[PDB]
Amino acid sequence: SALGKLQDVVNQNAQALNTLVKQLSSNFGAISSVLNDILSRLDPPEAEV
Amino acid sequence: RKRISNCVADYSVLYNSASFSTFKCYGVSPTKLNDLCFTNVYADSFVIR
Amino acid sequence: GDEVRQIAPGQTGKIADYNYKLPDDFTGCVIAWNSNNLDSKVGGNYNYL
């Protein structure tokens, strides 16, 4: 644990990136979190919401 | 109620049939229905006001 | 009288498909009135196709 100062920076960057990636799985109120799934189910006027 | 499964569904004829006064899809679009795969489909029949 | 919904924009139907379609971003006004007394005929008024 001597290099904890550098390990903290590495861990923080990796964890921020992982959280950014995991945010892609959220619905945010939509019917699905998959763009292809949304586009392959709804027509052009309803998929927009 | 009826569990409709193990079959190929052609919703195009159902959509084209003009006998229906009401035809609303609340999670998909009738045009896109023929391009989707479902695990199981339910059919509920009754006569209402 | 049923096809007024197809006359509304962003819809689907026989008229919306190959008789009369509107843009999804349509701007303007739609106006309708009953023309029974001026178009209906005992024969059937098949002038409208």
What does this structure look like?
This is part of a larger assembly, with 3 copies of chain A (49 residues). By secondary structure, chain A is mainly alpha-helical. In chain A, 49% of the residues lie in helices and 0% in strands. Chain A has helices at residues 4-22, 35-39. The radius of gyration of chain A is 18 Å and the shape is rod-shaped. Chain A starts with a helix and ends in a 10-residue tail after the last helix. It is classed as viral protein. Keywords: SARS-CoV-2 Spike protein Ectodomain with internal tag, viral protein. The entry is titled "Cryo-EM structure of SARS-CoV-2 spike protein Ecto-domain with internal tag, 1UP RBD conformation". Chains A, B, C: Spike glycoprotein.
Quaternary class: part of a larger assembly
> Counting H and I runs of at least 4 residues, what is the number of helices of chain A?
2
Q: Supply Rg of chain A.
A: 18 Å
User: How can the largest sheet of chain A be summarized?
Assistant: none
| Elements of chain A, N to C (H/E) | HH
Task: Provide the β-strand percentage band of chain A.
Answer: under 5%
PDB class: viral protein
Keywords: SARS-CoV-2 Spike protein Ectodomain with internal tag, viral protein
Entry title: Cryo-EM structure of SARS-CoV-2 spike protein Ecto-domain with internal tag, 1UP RBD conformation
Chains A, B, C: Spike glycoprotein
Keywords:
49% helix; mainly alpha; 3 chains; part of a larger assembly; Spike protein S2' (chain A); rod-shaped; 49 residues
